[PDB]
Amino acid sequence: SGFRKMAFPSGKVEGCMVQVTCGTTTLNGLWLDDVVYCPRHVICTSEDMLNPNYEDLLIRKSNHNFLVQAGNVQLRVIGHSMQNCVLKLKVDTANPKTPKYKFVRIQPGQTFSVLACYNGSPSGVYQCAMRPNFTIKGSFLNGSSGSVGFNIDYDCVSFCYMHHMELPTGVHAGTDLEGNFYGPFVDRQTAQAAGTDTTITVNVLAWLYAAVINGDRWFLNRFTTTLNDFNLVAMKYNYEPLTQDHVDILGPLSAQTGIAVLDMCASLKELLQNGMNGRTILGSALLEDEFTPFDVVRQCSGVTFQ
Amino acid sequence: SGFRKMAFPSGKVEGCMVQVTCGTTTLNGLWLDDVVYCPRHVICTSEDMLNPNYEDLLIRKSNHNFLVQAGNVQLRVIGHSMQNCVLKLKVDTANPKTPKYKFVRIQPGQTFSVLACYNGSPSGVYQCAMRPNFTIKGSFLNGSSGSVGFNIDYDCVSFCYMHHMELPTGVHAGTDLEGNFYGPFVDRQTAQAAGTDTTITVNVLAWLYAAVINGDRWFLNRFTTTLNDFNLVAMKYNYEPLTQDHVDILGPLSAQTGIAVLDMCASLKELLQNGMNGRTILGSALLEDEFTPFDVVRQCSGVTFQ
């Protein structure tokens, strides 16, 4: 019993983290095989970040201007290149701790673990969702750029996120490991609009199923609804529209609990219209949307990793 | 910016986890140097757990009745003994991945990370507090016994918890690494009273300071109070009494924010009497008590570990 915001075991990713320095800017890099991946703003000063021309700045840099340290040992940089917003530093040693890995670009609403790093070293790990507006609500301080987000499937690490930016609103933005930002953001110190942040409806439903499995179910009501009727409510509360793909993904949890997806939707509708009346669900006083349906099944069934 | 329930990087502890089997019961063990630590109820059947006589059950067991597997390799057991509620299996190989470590017995209200394990393998990691009533509100399924809780200080792992039991109320109980239960609990399947669960007042205050540092401060009021007056309120809301030791521990956060500890107490009093009126603090709709003052300072300043 119990239900917690659980992050993946971080050991496989810890062995990939290095420190990258260029001039007087230091941040984190990801060392996999003989390549180190890091944010290209490692070549910027504070002044450059107001309006950087990355191509022009990079041409001023040679391989020997990039210092890469893995623990106490210095890696020899033998080539460098820019891919979108990341730099790839070719080094002369393959990382002996490289795990099986993939690079993936996730969908909004999907979750991952972040290993927050400073100076190449881990500070902590936590589970995050990619918001519908492609930000994350992280915990990141100066120097945390190049920290990565990931999922694990048995022995394979899927890297999905590299941290780059804190927006003036205090939320966070970054790229996949090919260097393409999630959302409209750019690696420039300027004001950047993140649109309306909506709630990840299919995740809230999964978490309601988790609560039922754990025995919390005061919120189960006598009502049902339709997709179109539910979505009328979802629009008014800035919830993402629910689709039949989402209903399908929730099928296993519906089967386990005997609660039809549209019945749970009607319970969620009543929670949205009536609030919680001072009650809690799985220890929360609001509706939690950072568990996916796959996350609930993993945690309720004890899936392990190498 | 941002503030998250961050757990320690789990790599150092992952390399210590093994699987222990005795008869038809399997659970997790902790392999450090040439000793494997695990819950002594590894020698019980489901039937035995209703009323076990551990001394009599153990005498029936020899070294070769304990199977210890570390990944795909089998460890040779060369001695065994019971210390309180844990077994210590001496093995013929020292763990080559043993980290610098200590065994510590923590105080109620202190926090730690749990690496939830099944069959010797990690399923996930999360940050927990030891409740004032010596339970933890974990996420644990059958087979998770022997999962451990820990803190890290640079390169040294302080193991403070080994999981043993789920109470009929669904909360969790376990021991330090010397095998002594936290709280009054016993490793028997029977009804066990955990007393009143109170809120960890000094942790709520630390989290309020974290919120102020991150810019959330609608809750700061015009009032102040005294220790005795505040504690009158704390009693009525089942909060732990605040002491001058606690005020002292909060001093660095008071200094950083310019908010006297007793002023923050008066703000907390108003929150307790008036509620949140539908508002949130650091993304929570209730008062969060699983950050210690040391936790807030670590996260706000980016302390890293080896």
Swiss-Prot record, chains A, B:
Name assigned to this protein: 3C-like proteinase nsp5
Q: Where in the cell is it found?
A: Host cytoplasm; Host Golgi apparatus; Host nucleus
Stated consequence of mutating residue 90 to R: In strain: Beta/B.1.351
Catalysed reactions, as listed in the record: TSAVLQ-|-SGFRK-NH2 and SGVTFQ-|-GKFKK the two peptides corresponding to the two self-cleavage sites of the SARS 3C-like proteinase are the two most reactive peptide substrates. The enzyme exhibits a strong preference for substrates containing Gln at P1 position and Leu at P2 position
Species per Swiss-Prot/TrEMBL record = Severe acute respiratory syndrome coronavirus 2
- This protein's source sits in the domain of life called Viruses
> What does the record note on quaternary structure?
3CL-PRO exists as monomer and homodimer. Only the homodimer shows catalytic activity. Interacts with host FBXO22; this interaction promotes the proteasomal degradation of nsp5.
Task: Describe activation and inhibition of this protein.
Answer: Inhibited by pyridone-containing alpha-ketoamides compounds 13a and 13b. In turn, alpha-ketoamide 13b (tert-butyl (1-((S)-1-(((S)-4-(benzylamino)-3,4-dioxo-1-((S)-2-oxopyrrolidin-3-yl)butan-2-yl)amino)-3-cyclopropyl-1-oxopropan-2-yl)-2-oxo-1,2-dihydropyridin-3-yl)carbamate) inhibits SARS-CoV-2 replication in human lung cells. Inhibited ex vivo by michael acceptor inhibitor N3. Inhibited ex vivo by compound 11a and 11b.
Q: What is the effect of changing residue 132 to H?
A: In strain: Omicron/BA.1, Omicron/BA.2, Omicron/BA.2.12.1, Omicron/BA.2.75, Omicron/BA.4, Omicron/BA.5, Omicron/BQ.1.1, Omicron/XBB.1.5, Omicron/EG.5.1
